[PDB]
Each structure stands twice: as C-alpha cells, then as structure tokens.
Amino acid sequence: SHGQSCLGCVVLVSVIEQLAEVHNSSVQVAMERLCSYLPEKLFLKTACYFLVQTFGSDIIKLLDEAMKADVVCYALEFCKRGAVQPQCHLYPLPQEAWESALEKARQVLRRSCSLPFLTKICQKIELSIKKAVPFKDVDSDKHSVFPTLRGYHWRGRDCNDSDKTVYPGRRPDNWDIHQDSNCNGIWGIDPKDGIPYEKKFCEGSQPRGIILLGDAAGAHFHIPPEWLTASQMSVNSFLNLPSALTDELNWPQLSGVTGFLDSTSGIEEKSIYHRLRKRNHCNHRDYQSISKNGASSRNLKNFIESLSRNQASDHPAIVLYAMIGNDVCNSKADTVPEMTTPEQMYANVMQTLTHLNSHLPNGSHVILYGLPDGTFLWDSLHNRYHPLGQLNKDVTYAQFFSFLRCLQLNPCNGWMSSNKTLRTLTSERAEQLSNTLKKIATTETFANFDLFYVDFAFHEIIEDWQKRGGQPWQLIEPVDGFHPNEVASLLQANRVWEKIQLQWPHVLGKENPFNSQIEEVFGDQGGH
Ligand SMILES: CCCCCCCCCCCCCCCCCC(=O)OC[C@H](COP(=O)([O-])O)OC(=O)CCCCCCCCCCCCCCCCC
Ligand SMILES: *[C@@H]1O[C@H](CO)[C@@H](O[C@@H]2O[C@H](CO)[C@@H](O)[C@H](O)[C@H]2NC(C)=O)[C@H](O)[C@H]1NC(C)=O
Ligand SMILES: *[C@@H]1O[C@H](CO)[C@@H](O[C@@H]2O[C@H](CO)[C@@H](O)[C@H](O)[C@H]2NC(C)=O)[C@H](O)[C@H]1NC(C)=O
Ligand SMILES: CCCCCCCCCCCCCC(=O)O
Ligand SMILES: *[C@@H]1O[C@H](CO)[C@@H](O)[C@H](O)[C@H]1NC(C)=O
Ligand SMILES: [Ca+2]
Ligand SMILES: [Ca+2]
Ligand SMILES: [Ca+2]
Numbered sequence: 001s002h003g004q005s006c007l008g009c010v011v012l013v014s015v016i017e018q019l020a021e022v023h024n025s026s027v028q029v030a031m032e033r034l035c036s037y038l039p040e041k042l043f044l045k046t047a048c049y050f051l052v053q054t055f056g057s058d059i060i061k062l063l064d065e066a067m068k069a070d071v072v073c074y075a076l077e078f079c080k081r082g083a084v085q086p087q088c089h090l091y092p093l094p095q096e097a098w099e100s101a102l103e104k105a106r107q108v109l110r111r112s113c114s115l116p117f118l119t120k121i122c123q124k125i126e127l128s129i130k131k132a133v134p135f136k137d138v139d140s141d142k143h144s145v146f147p148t149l150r151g152y153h154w155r156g157r158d159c160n161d162s163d164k165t166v167y168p169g170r171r172p173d174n175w176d177i178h179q180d181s182n183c184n185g186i187w188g189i190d191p192k193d194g195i196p197y198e199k200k201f202c203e204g205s206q207p208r209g210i211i212l213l214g215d216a217a218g219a220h221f222h223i224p225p226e227w228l229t230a231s232q233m234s235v236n237s238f239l240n241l242p243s244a245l246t247d248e249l250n251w252p253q254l255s256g257v258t259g260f261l262d263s264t265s266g267i268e269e270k271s272i273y274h275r276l277r278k279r280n281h282c283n284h285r286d287y288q289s290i291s292k293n294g295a296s297s298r299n300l301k302n303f304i305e306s307l308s309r310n311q312a313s314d315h316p317a318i319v320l321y322a323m324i325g326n327d328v329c330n331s332k333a334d335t336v337p338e339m340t341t342p343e344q345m346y347a348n349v350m351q352t353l354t355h356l357n358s359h360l361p362n363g364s365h366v367i368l369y370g371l372p373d374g375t376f377l378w379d380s381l382h383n384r385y386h387p388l389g390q391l392n393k394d395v396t397y398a399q400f401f402s403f404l405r406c407l408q409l410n411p412c413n414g415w416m417s418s419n420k421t422l423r424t425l426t427s428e429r430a431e432q433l434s435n436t437l438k439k440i441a442t443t444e445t446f447a448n449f450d451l452f453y454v455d456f457a458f459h460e461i462i463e464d465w466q467k468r469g470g471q472p473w474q475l476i477e478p479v480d481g482f483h484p485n486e487v488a489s490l491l492q493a494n495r496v497w498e499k500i501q502l503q504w505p506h507v508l509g510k511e512n513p514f515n516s517q518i519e520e521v522f523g524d525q526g527g528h
Helices: 001-024 025-035 041-063 067-077 095-113 120-128 197-202 243-245 272-279 341-355 375-381 397-407 420-441 458-467 486-503 515-522
Strands: 210-216 285-289 317-322 366-368 448-453
Touching: 001 025, 001 041, 001 067, 001 397, 025 041, 025 515, 041 067, 041 243, 067 095, 067 243, 120 243, 197 515, 210 272, 272 317, 272 486, 317 341, 341 366, 341 420, 341 448, 366 420, 366 486, 375 458, 397 420, 420 448, 448 486, 458 486
Parallel strands: 210 285, 210 317, 317 366, 366 448
Antiparallel strands: none
C-alpha cells in the first residue's frame, strides 16, 4: 500500500517528465496532454485532471529543479521512509547527492484513494480482485453476457442469462430440439431426416471442456508498454485501459490455455481451447479460466469453488493445475523461508485433487504442470532497458527489480535478483516442488478423473524461439519483467498439447467427423 502509492507516483511523474521531453513542452502542457489521452470511462480522465489540479503545481516546481521522479515522490510524501522501510532510489545517485536533492525539494515546497474519483476507481478495482464470479449474471450460473468483471473473457458466454440450466459445458437437454441448452450453437432438427442436429453431430463425440486453475501467468497478466512509453503515446494507447482494469490486468481471452480471440502476434500457435474446439466443434464456448493473480498451491482453496461444473449434469473436463510459480515467487525480503516446502505442496495439492474429485463429472482428466526454471529471466533482462527507461537509457531491469525489492513489491525476490546463489536456490526449490507434483500424478488415483504430469520446460520454448530467429528477452512481459508474454504462453501450450497427443491421446478425445457439417449448418456457431 505504501509501496503501491510510491510506485504509482514514480510511474506517473516519469511519464509526465518524458512527455515534456518528447514534445519539447512545459510540464504543464505535458500534464494536460496526458489527461487528454485518457478514456472518459471509469472516471479515468476525470481522475487525472483532479490529480493535476491537486499536485500539478508542485510537480512543475520540482521538475523545474531537475528532480527525478523518485525524489519528487518522496518530497510529495507518496513515498516515505520508515523504521523498517528505507528510502528507495530508482536512479543511481551518491547518498549525499540524493539527500541534497531531497532537501532542496522539501525547501522548494515550503515556499508555498480518498480523493474524488480515484476513490471510485479504487473501490471498483478492489471488488474486481475480491470476486471470482461475474458481476453481471442474472441467473447465477457463473456465465455472463458481458466480457469483463469475470464475464465471458473468463468463461464461455451465456446464451441464456435467464435460465440457470442453460450454459456452456452442460449435457444437452434432450438433444437441444427447441433450445441450444449448452450454448455450443448446435440445436434444432435436420429437415432431411428429422434427427436432432446435436444428436447426429455430437452423440458419441465425447465432448469435454477446458478448465484452467491458474495464476497471473495463466490468466495472461499484461500491462501494455504503450501505457508507459511517452515516445509513442496517444489517445489510441489507452483505449484498452478500462477493459484491462476491469479484467484485473489479465487477458484470459488471449491466454495460451483459454484464449478464444485471434492472437496479437498472429503466429500459427493457437490456445488449448482453440485446438480442442477445432478437434470437436461440439466444444464451442466450453472454456473456464479459474485463475487469480497471486494464486499458489496454498491459496487456490480460497477461490476454487468459483469453478462451475455440475457432476451430474455437465460434460467432463480437462483440468490444468497450473500453479507455476507463486509457491517459490514472493515479496518477502527473507524469501526462501516463505517458499512452499515439498511436504506442504503435497498436502495442498492432495486437498485440491480430493475437492476436484467431488466436483468434476466422471471421465475428467487432470494434468499437473511442473514449475519453470526462472533463472533465464534475470539472465535475459538484467542489462536491458525497462520501458520507463528506454527514452533516456536510464532504467535497466536490474534497477527496476532493485527498486521493487526495496518497496517490497518485487513479484519474485528469488529469481529477479542480482544474487546468483539465491537464483540457484529458487530453481532448486522449484524443481523439488515439480518432483512432488510428478510423484503425486504417478502414484495417487481418484474415482472421477485420471491424473497426469507435464513439465514446464521453458528451455524448450527458448530453443523453439531461438530456432525461429528470436531472442529470449522477447518471451517476457516488458512492463513486469517476470511473466511469460502472449507468444511464450502460446508456445508452451503448443508443447503441452503435443505432449498430451503423444502420451495420452485419449485425453484429447477423437476428432469429430461431423466438424465440416457442423460448420455448414451453423457457421461460427454463434461466436464467442
Ligand atoms: C501522484 C499520483 C499517484 C497515483 C497515480 C496512479 C498511477 C498508476 C498507479 C500504479 C499502481 C501500481 C499497481 C502495481 C500492482 C499491479 C500488479 C498486481 O497487483 O497484480 C499482481 C501481479 C502478478 O501477480 P503474480 O504473478 O504474483 O501471480 O503483480 C505484478 O505483476 C507486479 C507488477 C509490478 C510492475 C508494475 C510496473 C508499472 C505499474 C503499472 C502502472 C499502470 C499504468 C496505468 C496508466 C498509466 C498512466 C500514465
Ligand atoms: C431463455 O430461458 C427463458 C426461461 O426458461 C425462456 O423463457 C421461457 O420461454 C418459454 C417458451 O415456451 C415459456 O414457456 C416460459 O414461460 C419462459 N419462462 C420465463 C421464466 O419467462 C426463453 O425463451 C429462453 N430463451 C431462448 C432463446 O430459448
Ligand atoms: C545471496 O544469497 C545467499 C542465499 O540466500 C546468501 O547466503 C546466505 O547468507 C546467510 C548470511 O547472510 C547465511 O546464514 C546463509 O547460510 C547463506 N546461504 C547460502 C545458501 O549461502 C548471501 O548472503 C547473499 N549474498 C548477498 C551479497 O546478499
Ligand atoms: C492517471 C490517473 C488514472 C490512474 C489509474 C490507476 C490504474 C492502476 C490501478 C492498478 C490496477 C491493479 C489491478 C489488479 O491487478 O488487480
Ligand atoms: C468413470 O469413467 C471411467 C473412464 O471412462 C470408467 O472407467 C469408470 O467405469 C467410470 N465410473 C463409473 C462409476 O461409471
Ligand atoms: Ca448467467
Ligand atoms: Ca444461463
Ligand atoms: Ca447445443
């Protein structure tokens, strides 16, 4: 909270200063320009102009004294030193020079979420974090007709939000003669022979859904670098800001597992959902991302009940257990003691699997993902420039991670660290947890699903990518410097798909021979 207010101030002031540089304008003009770019939705533009009204004169005075954003934000008291909270420097400065600058700033100012609108934004964000089910959902079946706030970006769109027995993944109601009860777009009678289309096209095709149990990576956490790069900034940079905020800065609709939109990169690789739908068009809309920022084996229990699958009335599902780093990645200064132990991981996963067995239809399939070896994050990025540092070449990822660490906001103290010993210990723990998951999958059995393990194998992805001409830093989210980006997520989903195809082809089911007839009769099946 102190960390978040400090970091927010430093980012905003940095963008203001860089916009003044890019346009060769005054700071007043740069601040007007920033606010002018923002959407009116969610009070974003209005909040910006209120901030400029409240703090703008002081920002002008301190940038006029050549203070950088970190000094400005301490002078303005958005950043504060405490007994167990040192002052955090984003830019390298001798201590004397930092203290002189901060004292000058404080002198300049002496000469002469409670805020309106921002409070509204803060409340809506908190509510989005707290809730794992859609806000708009008249019939309470957890599927929505709206995209964000845990709506159809996260799970198949509800084709009838006035009927809690109509939703994606349901076994059809007497072959869907009069209503498309399972939202796959297939319904009605073939006039040639009187046979219900859902019966002739889907009977015996063994439909199944895809369910992700995921973290921020799984939900495709992504802050557009366009929001922080003054050199290319305009109105069009922020058009996606309202939707991204109401999706908790996640983009599940573009994720490697549950993505259903056309990919940004346009690469061949498609999401697991897209491949399952392609294999059997009866599976149209049967995706769910049961994923939350910060999820780990320890706290998945706090939102897994948001999963929607009726054991008696729904088709089976492929369930991917993808707690792929927060059991080792944390923000505690003494970070190793905070990491999950193999014994804790065993207990936590067994509790999840026992819960799943009583909440999945029989015939389901559960795949446990191993944890990545994140040592290539530091290796790939530490000398490159962060988006906020690209204009003036003055913030490397090493400097960015050090700043976050000081603020207790670094998302992975163990891997995003200049300390090689610590990075090695973190990878060792991740491999021990992966071994625990592999032991569970090859030993424990459950009545309603079979159980499997797949390794994460980031090295396979980096090799695929380097073979195509790419570099490893291009696989990482530029703003957070931590999460796999959209490309990386899709490449990893491709590896997983192909492993399942070779190792356990029954998990994917058969290719439906009526796919082409489904498209001829129903087209896009109602879209997404
Ligand atoms: C004087 C006015 C002051 C107020 C002005 C407001 C300006 C913007 C406020 C910034 C608020 C800072 C929020 C940081 C927290 C976001 C990340 C988060 O909470 O989600 C969890 C995520 C990953 O979770 P996991 O991987 O641990 O599972 O955790 C992470 O991935 C950590 C992310 C850390 C990197 C963030 C770098 C930059 C912040 C992004 C700001 C977004 C820009 C918004 C518009 C900008 C207008 C210029
Ligand atoms: C969505 O579900 C609602 C509720 O089941 C449907 O409305 C019903 O329509 C039938 C049609 O025969 C009526 O007999 C019921 O009285 C209606 N129920 C209510 C509560 O109004 C609606 O038709 C469904 N939409 C589609 C496209 O099938
Ligand atoms: C780099 O990290 C390593 C591992 O976390 C630190 O090594 C530990 O240091 C403490 C004392 O500071 C010892 O009690 C531990 O036994 C050490 N553990 C290991 C595995 O060596 C090391 O101090 C860190 N180095 C720097 C420069 O911060
Ligand atoms: C410049 C004025 C507008 C400021 C908008 C603040 C946007 C940052 C909010 C951070 C959202 C975090 C969402 C989440 O990860 O749960
Ligand atoms: C559940 O499905 C599995 C796999 O198809 C099958 O072997 C088993 O007999 C089923 N269990 C029941 C109780 O029908
Ligand atoms: Ca609904
Ligand atoms: Ca419904
Ligand atoms: Ca149907």
